[PDB]
Short mmCIF file of C-alpha atoms and ligand atoms in Angstrom, two decimals:
data_model
loop_
_atom_site.label_atom_id
_atom_site.label_comp_id
_atom_site.label_asym_id
_atom_site.label_seq_id
_atom_site.Cartn_x
_atom_site.Cartn_y
_atom_site.Cartn_z
CA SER S 1 9.16 14.66 89.46
CA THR S 2 8.57 11.86 86.94
CA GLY S 3 7.00 11.32 83.45
CA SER S 4 5.50 8.28 81.66
CA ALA S 5 4.45 8.25 77.94
CA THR S 6 3.16 5.59 75.49
CA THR S 7 5.25 4.81 72.30
CA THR S 8 3.57 3.23 69.23
CA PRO S 9 4.95 1.59 65.98
CA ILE S 10 4.29 3.81 62.90
CA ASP S 11 3.42 0.83 60.58
CA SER S 12 3.01 -2.96 60.44
CA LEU S 13 6.81 -3.64 60.13
CA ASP S 14 7.95 -1.72 63.28
CA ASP S 15 10.04 0.60 61.00
CA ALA S 16 10.03 3.31 63.76
CA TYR S 17 8.15 4.36 66.96
CA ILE S 18 6.27 7.70 67.75
CA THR S 19 5.61 9.31 71.23
CA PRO S 20 3.35 12.41 71.95
CA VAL S 21 5.11 15.64 73.02
CA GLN S 22 3.33 18.90 74.27
CA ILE S 23 5.06 22.11 73.07
CA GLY S 24 4.12 25.71 74.09
CA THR S 25 1.28 27.55 75.90
CA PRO S 26 -1.54 26.53 75.29
CA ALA S 27 0.00 23.04 74.54
CA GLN S 28 0.43 21.98 70.82
CA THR S 29 0.65 18.12 70.67
CA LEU S 30 3.12 16.61 68.01
CA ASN S 31 4.16 12.90 67.55
CA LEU S 32 8.02 12.71 67.65
CA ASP S 33 10.63 9.87 66.96
CA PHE S 34 12.60 9.44 70.26
CA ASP S 35 16.22 8.79 69.06
CA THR S 36 19.09 7.67 71.39
CA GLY S 37 21.51 7.93 68.31
CA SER S 38 21.23 11.78 67.87
CA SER S 39 20.90 14.94 70.05
CA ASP S 40 18.53 17.48 68.30
CA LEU S 41 14.79 18.17 69.17
CA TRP S 42 13.50 19.45 65.75
CA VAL S 43 9.91 19.83 64.40
CA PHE S 44 7.85 20.53 61.26
CA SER S 45 6.66 24.15 61.70
CA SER S 46 4.75 27.19 60.28
CA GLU S 47 8.25 28.14 58.87
CA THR S 48 8.74 24.93 56.77
CA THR S 49 8.62 25.38 52.93
CA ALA S 50 4.91 24.61 52.12
CA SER S 51 5.68 22.18 49.21
CA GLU S 52 7.83 20.05 51.65
CA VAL S 53 4.93 19.69 54.22
CA UNK S 54 2.51 16.77 53.64
CA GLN S 55 2.31 16.18 59.36
CA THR S 56 1.12 18.27 62.37
CA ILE S 57 3.14 21.55 62.68
CA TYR S 58 4.38 23.73 65.57
CA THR S 59 3.41 27.51 65.28
CA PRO S 60 5.68 29.58 67.65
CA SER S 61 3.52 32.79 67.20
CA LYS S 62 0.56 30.96 68.86
CA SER S 63 2.61 30.11 72.03
CA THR S 64 2.75 32.77 74.81
CA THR S 65 5.99 31.14 76.27
CA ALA S 66 8.03 30.90 72.94
CA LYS S 67 11.29 33.00 72.74
CA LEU S 68 13.53 33.32 69.58
CA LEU S 69 17.20 32.32 70.38
CA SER S 70 18.85 35.25 68.55
CA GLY S 71 21.63 34.32 66.06
CA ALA S 72 21.21 30.53 66.36
CA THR S 73 20.92 28.09 63.42
CA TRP S 74 21.03 24.26 62.97
CA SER S 75 21.68 21.66 60.17
CA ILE S 76 21.75 17.81 60.55
CA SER S 77 22.23 14.72 58.30
CA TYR S 78 21.65 11.05 59.20
CA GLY S 79 23.23 7.70 58.13
CA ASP S 80 20.46 7.00 55.62
CA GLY S 81 21.28 10.36 53.87
CA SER S 82 18.16 12.28 55.19
CA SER S 83 18.58 15.95 56.42
CA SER S 84 16.88 19.15 57.73
CA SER S 85 17.86 22.73 58.87
CA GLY S 86 16.39 26.00 60.34
CA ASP S 87 16.31 28.46 63.32
CA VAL S 88 15.79 27.99 67.13
CA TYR S 89 13.14 28.87 69.83
CA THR S 90 13.17 28.13 73.59
CA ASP S 91 9.69 27.01 74.93
CA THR S 92 7.91 24.84 77.57
CA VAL S 93 8.05 21.10 76.60
CA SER S 94 6.16 18.28 78.44
CA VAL S 95 6.54 14.47 77.97
CA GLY S 96 4.17 12.13 79.86
CA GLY S 97 3.38 14.77 82.57
CA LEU S 98 7.10 15.85 83.07
CA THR S 99 7.49 19.61 82.25
CA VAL S 100 10.80 21.35 81.26
CA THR S 101 10.93 25.17 80.86
CA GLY S 102 13.47 26.80 78.50
CA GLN S 103 13.94 23.73 76.15
CA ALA S 104 15.53 24.42 72.69
CA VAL S 105 12.92 23.62 69.98
CA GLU S 106 14.62 23.56 66.49
CA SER S 107 12.07 24.86 63.89
CA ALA S 108 12.61 23.43 60.33
CA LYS S 109 12.80 25.90 57.41
CA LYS S 110 13.41 22.88 55.02
CA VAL S 111 13.23 19.00 55.27
CA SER S 112 14.52 16.22 52.88
CA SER S 113 12.26 14.06 50.69
CA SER S 114 12.26 11.01 53.08
CA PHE S 115 10.76 13.21 55.92
CA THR S 116 8.06 14.75 53.58
CA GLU S 117 7.12 11.15 52.48
CA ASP S 118 6.45 9.94 56.05
CA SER S 119 3.11 11.31 57.24
CA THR S 120 3.31 9.80 60.79
CA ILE S 121 6.55 11.53 62.05
CA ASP S 122 6.24 15.30 63.03
CA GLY S 123 9.99 15.56 64.01
CA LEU S 124 12.74 13.99 66.23
CA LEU S 125 13.53 14.14 70.01
CA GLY S 126 17.29 13.32 70.45
CA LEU S 127 18.49 11.45 73.61
CA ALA S 128 22.29 10.91 72.85
CA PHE S 129 24.90 13.17 74.60
CA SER S 130 24.58 16.96 74.10
CA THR S 131 28.09 17.13 72.44
CA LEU S 132 26.42 15.82 69.18
CA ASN S 133 23.80 18.72 69.05
CA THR S 134 24.03 20.69 65.73
CA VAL S 135 23.00 24.25 66.96
CA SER S 136 25.62 26.97 66.24
CA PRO S 137 27.30 29.04 67.57
CA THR S 138 26.46 27.50 71.06
CA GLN S 139 25.21 23.88 71.22
CA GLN S 140 21.87 23.22 73.08
CA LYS S 141 21.01 20.61 75.80
CA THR S 142 18.73 17.62 75.23
CA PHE S 143 15.30 17.29 76.97
CA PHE S 144 16.88 14.64 79.31
CA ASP S 145 19.84 16.90 80.28
CA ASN S 146 17.39 19.80 81.13
CA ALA S 147 15.11 17.48 83.21
CA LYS S 148 17.84 15.94 85.46
CA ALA S 149 17.76 18.67 88.19
CA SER S 150 14.02 18.00 88.90
CA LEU S 151 13.86 14.17 88.32
CA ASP S 152 13.49 11.74 91.24
CA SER S 153 16.57 9.87 89.75
CA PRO S 154 18.75 10.92 86.67
CA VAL S 155 17.56 8.01 84.47
CA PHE S 156 15.20 7.20 81.56
CA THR S 157 14.03 3.71 80.40
CA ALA S 158 13.01 2.33 76.95
CA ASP S 159 10.44 -0.53 76.77
CA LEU S 160 9.72 -0.96 72.98
CA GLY S 161 6.99 -3.42 71.88
CA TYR S 162 7.04 -6.16 69.14
CA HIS S 163 4.14 -5.06 66.85
CA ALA S 164 2.58 -3.52 70.05
CA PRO S 165 2.51 -0.29 72.23
CA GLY S 166 5.35 0.31 74.74
CA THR S 167 6.62 2.95 77.24
CA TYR S 168 9.29 5.63 77.78
CA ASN S 169 9.68 6.56 81.55
CA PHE S 170 11.67 9.47 82.99
CA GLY S 171 12.95 9.60 86.66
CA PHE S 172 12.12 6.05 87.96
CA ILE S 173 12.59 2.31 87.25
CA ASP S 174 9.31 0.29 87.09
CA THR S 175 10.22 -3.04 88.80
CA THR S 176 7.05 -4.67 87.35
CA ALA S 177 8.17 -4.11 83.67
CA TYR S 178 11.02 -6.73 83.51
CA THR S 179 12.06 -10.24 84.77
CA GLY S 180 15.24 -11.20 86.71
CA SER S 181 17.67 -8.34 87.54
CA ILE S 182 19.22 -5.48 85.50
CA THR S 183 22.96 -5.97 84.54
CA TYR S 184 24.87 -2.67 84.01
CA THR S 185 27.91 -2.18 81.63
CA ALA S 186 30.35 0.69 81.06
CA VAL S 187 29.63 3.48 78.51
CA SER S 188 32.22 5.43 76.45
CA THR S 189 31.09 9.00 75.43
CA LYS S 190 34.24 9.69 73.26
CA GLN S 191 32.07 9.65 70.05
CA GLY S 192 28.90 11.20 71.73
CA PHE S 193 26.84 7.93 71.68
CA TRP S 194 25.58 5.39 74.26
CA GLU S 195 28.64 3.24 73.16
CA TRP S 196 29.43 -0.08 74.98
CA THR S 197 31.21 -3.45 74.41
CA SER S 198 29.15 -6.68 74.21
CA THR S 199 31.06 -9.77 75.59
CA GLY S 200 30.06 -12.09 72.63
CA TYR S 201 27.20 -13.98 70.93
CA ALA S 202 25.53 -17.35 70.21
CA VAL S 203 23.34 -18.54 67.26
CA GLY S 204 20.24 -20.59 68.25
CA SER S 205 21.15 -23.54 70.57
CA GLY S 206 24.94 -23.41 69.69
CA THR S 207 28.05 -22.22 71.58
CA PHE S 208 28.66 -18.70 73.00
CA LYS S 209 31.82 -17.18 71.30
CA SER S 210 33.69 -14.66 73.54
CA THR S 211 34.58 -11.94 71.02
CA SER S 212 34.38 -8.24 72.00
CA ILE S 213 31.78 -6.30 69.88
CA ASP S 214 31.98 -2.45 70.24
CA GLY S 215 28.61 -0.86 69.29
CA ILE S 216 25.89 1.80 70.08
CA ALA S 217 22.33 1.56 71.64
CA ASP S 218 20.25 3.42 68.93
CA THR S 219 16.38 3.63 69.15
CA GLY S 220 16.31 5.64 65.83
CA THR S 221 17.76 2.69 63.71
CA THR S 222 15.36 -0.14 62.71
CA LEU S 223 17.73 -3.21 62.35
CA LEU S 224 20.64 -5.01 64.22
CA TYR S 225 24.02 -4.29 62.37
CA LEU S 226 26.95 -6.60 63.44
CA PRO S 227 30.43 -7.73 62.07
CA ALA S 228 30.46 -9.57 58.70
CA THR S 229 31.86 -12.88 60.26
CA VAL S 230 29.12 -12.83 63.02
CA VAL S 231 26.26 -12.17 60.48
CA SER S 232 27.62 -14.96 58.17
CA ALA S 233 27.62 -17.43 61.14
CA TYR S 234 23.89 -16.55 61.85
CA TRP S 235 22.60 -16.96 58.21
CA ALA S 236 24.68 -20.23 57.75
CA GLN S 237 21.98 -21.79 60.04
CA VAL S 238 19.06 -20.69 57.67
CA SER S 239 18.94 -23.09 54.64
CA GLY S 240 17.22 -20.68 52.12
CA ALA S 241 19.16 -17.54 53.15
CA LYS S 242 21.50 -15.81 50.66
CA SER S 243 23.04 -12.35 50.24
CA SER S 244 21.27 -10.29 47.52
CA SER S 245 23.29 -7.57 45.81
CA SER S 246 20.13 -6.04 44.21
CA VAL S 247 17.87 -5.99 47.37
CA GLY S 248 20.73 -4.81 49.60
CA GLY S 249 21.27 -7.58 52.26
CA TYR S 250 20.43 -11.09 53.37
CA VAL S 251 17.00 -12.43 52.14
CA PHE S 252 15.36 -15.75 53.06
CA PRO S 253 12.01 -17.64 52.64
CA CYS S 254 9.15 -16.09 54.75
CA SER S 255 8.07 -19.69 55.73
CA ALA S 256 11.39 -20.36 57.59
CA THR S 257 11.31 -20.84 61.41
CA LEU S 258 14.38 -18.71 62.30
CA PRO S 259 16.90 -19.45 65.15
CA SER S 260 17.17 -17.03 68.11
CA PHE S 261 20.27 -14.73 68.46
CA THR S 262 21.83 -14.19 71.96
CA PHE S 263 24.18 -11.27 72.87
CA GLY S 264 26.32 -10.88 76.03
CA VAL S 265 26.03 -8.02 78.64
CA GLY S 266 28.90 -8.81 81.04
CA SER S 267 28.06 -12.31 82.39
CA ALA S 268 24.32 -11.86 81.50
CA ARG S 269 22.57 -12.90 78.23
CA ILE S 270 19.73 -11.19 76.20
CA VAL S 271 17.84 -13.57 73.83
CA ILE S 272 16.26 -12.10 70.65
CA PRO S 273 13.45 -14.51 69.54
CA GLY S 274 13.75 -15.79 65.91
CA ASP S 275 10.38 -14.14 64.98
CA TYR S 276 11.89 -10.65 65.79
CA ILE S 277 14.64 -11.33 63.10
CA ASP S 278 11.99 -11.78 60.35
CA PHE S 279 11.64 -8.07 59.33
CA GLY S 280 8.87 -8.83 56.81
CA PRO S 281 8.19 -9.46 53.08
CA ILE S 282 10.27 -7.54 50.47
CA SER S 283 6.87 -6.46 49.02
CA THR S 284 3.22 -7.36 50.03
CA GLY S 285 2.58 -11.00 49.00
CA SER S 286 6.24 -11.94 48.25
CA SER S 287 7.62 -15.36 49.25
CA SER S 288 10.98 -13.69 50.18
CA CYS S 289 11.54 -11.79 53.47
CA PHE S 290 14.30 -9.30 54.49
CA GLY S 291 16.59 -10.24 57.44
CA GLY S 292 16.59 -8.22 60.71
CA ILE S 293 20.39 -8.93 61.29
CA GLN S 294 22.70 -7.39 58.56
CA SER S 295 26.48 -6.63 58.15
CA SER S 296 27.84 -3.34 59.65
CA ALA S 297 30.76 -3.25 57.04
CA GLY S 298 29.19 -0.42 54.99
CA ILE S 299 28.30 1.71 58.12
CA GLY S 300 31.65 1.37 59.84
CA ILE S 301 30.10 0.99 63.37
CA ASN S 302 28.06 -1.84 65.01
CA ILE S 303 24.42 -0.70 65.84
CA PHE S 304 22.08 -2.29 68.45
CA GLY S 305 18.86 -0.88 66.80
CA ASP S 306 15.14 -1.65 67.43
CA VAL S 307 15.38 -5.43 66.50
CA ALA S 308 17.76 -5.89 69.51
CA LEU S 309 16.34 -3.24 71.96
CA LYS S 310 12.67 -4.39 71.72
CA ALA S 311 13.79 -7.80 73.22
CA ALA S 312 14.95 -6.02 76.45
CA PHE S 313 14.04 -3.47 79.21
CA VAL S 314 16.86 -0.85 78.70
CA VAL S 315 18.05 1.64 81.38
CA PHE S 316 19.91 4.82 80.23
CA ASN S 317 21.68 5.92 83.47
CA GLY S 318 22.68 9.58 83.04
CA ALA S 319 24.67 10.06 86.19
CA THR S 320 28.00 11.98 85.81
CA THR S 321 29.69 8.68 84.85
CA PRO S 322 26.92 7.14 82.63
CA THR S 323 26.17 3.39 82.37
CA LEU S 324 23.74 1.22 80.34
CA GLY S 325 21.53 -1.52 81.86
CA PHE S 326 19.73 -4.46 80.25
CA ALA S 327 17.08 -6.86 81.66
CA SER S 328 15.07 -9.66 80.07
CA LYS S 329 11.25 -9.09 79.83
C1 0EM J 1 24.67 14.19 64.77
C2 0EM J 1 24.34 13.24 63.67
C3 0EM J 1 24.11 11.82 64.22
C4 0EM J 1 25.43 11.10 64.40
C5 0EM J 1 23.24 10.99 63.32
N1 0EM J 1 22.84 9.69 63.81
C6 0EM J 1 22.31 8.79 62.93
O1 0EM J 1 22.33 8.96 61.71
C7 0EM J 1 21.67 7.53 63.47
P1 0EM J 1 19.92 7.72 63.86
O2 0EM J 1 19.42 6.57 64.64
O3 0EM J 1 19.82 9.06 64.58
C8 0EM J 1 18.95 7.77 62.32
C9 0EM J 1 17.53 8.39 62.56
C10 0EM J 1 16.55 8.42 61.35
C11 0EM J 1 15.17 8.94 61.84
C12 0EM J 1 17.07 9.18 60.15
N2 0EM J 1 18.95 6.48 61.65
C13 0EM J 1 19.41 6.20 60.42
O4 0EM J 1 19.99 7.01 59.69
C14 0EM J 1 19.24 4.76 59.92
C15 0EM J 1 20.43 4.42 59.04
C16 0EM J 1 21.78 4.43 59.71
C17 0EM J 1 22.14 4.48 61.02
N3 0EM J 1 23.52 4.46 61.11
C18 0EM J 1 24.02 4.38 59.86
N4 0EM J 1 23.01 4.35 59.01
N5 0EM J 1 17.90 4.68 59.30
C19 0EM J 1 17.03 3.67 59.58
O5 0EM J 1 17.28 2.65 60.28
C20 0EM J 1 15.58 3.80 59.04
C21 0EM J 1 14.64 4.42 60.06
C22 0EM J 1 13.28 4.95 59.71
C23 0EM J 1 12.26 4.15 59.20
C24 0EM J 1 11.01 4.62 58.89
C25 0EM J 1 10.72 5.96 59.04
C26 0EM J 1 11.71 6.78 59.56
C27 0EM J 1 12.95 6.30 59.91
N6 0EM J 1 15.11 2.45 58.62
C28 0EM J 1 15.58 1.84 57.52
O6 0EM J 1 16.34 2.27 56.65
O7 0EM J 1 15.05 0.52 57.47
C29 0EM J 1 15.27 -0.45 56.42
C30 0EM J 1 16.77 -0.77 56.41
C31 0EM J 1 14.47 -1.69 56.84
C32 0EM J 1 14.69 0.01 55.09
#
């Protein structure tokens, strides 16, 4: 079997992307944030504290196929300080025509203020390795792990758009969605992420520096976070750019024509256009814009988030020894 679903930006800045998911019998359709940096499928529900709901909710008592997982609870927090917690059902879950039976669906009893405040996101669908799942006492498998037995190939692909709709595919590689060939690179699962080592970088039309950069492929993070010396070399080529203590990163004039940024995948090269690195104005009508490349010093890990991934066709190969592929598009 295979599945194919459309993913859409939530707002005019590409802050995040939503994808429809069918849960239960008859199907209840929710719009979820597909996140390769975490491993929980959790939803707003009929159980969520009513003052913390502003979203479409899942009602397990209206689904003939829902089963309570007795004794099981969950609790998660993210790098931006957001959090949620609750109890666990198993139910039928479909994405893009691909159906999985027995999937763990984590029903929120409570959500943090940043989730209440975002009307467009009805929950998360995690796609990192199942060792990061927060269900206790026994961790639960991701939607991808449960689908692998039936899929035509144990793979999924991410094709995110720049201010435009895109695609998540399960079980096949669409050879019409990219240019050139895919280059594959080794993955370490020791921290539970799609973790890999880039071979180096170049700024604009300058020289490629061979310096190893260990980082993660993370569809749930908006920006590209890289070492302080690398980020300083990029903004040195932008004449109005400066670090702002009060705004929280590099800022520059919205009228600038920014240089591209190239990262290495083995011997291959992925080019992020300069326009993708202009995140947008600090407020509507400002002359100052926030940068899409920022230092990873305060995070402690390098993160290839949406600014980087939307410049590529990305293959998440979930064979027993996993690998990560990148192609130009
Ligand atoms: C088991 C626990 C895991 C290890 C947790 N994993 C993570 O925290 C990484 P993530 O990609 O799953 C997680 C998902 C979010 C939906 C909360 N992302 C994050 O926590 C990162 C911050 C981060 C990452 N790493 C360190 N800090 N947040 C972000 O990047 C949010 C995303 C967002 C925007 C709009 C609406 C919803 C969500 N954007 C954001 O803060 O953007 C600006 C910097 C421009 C203001």
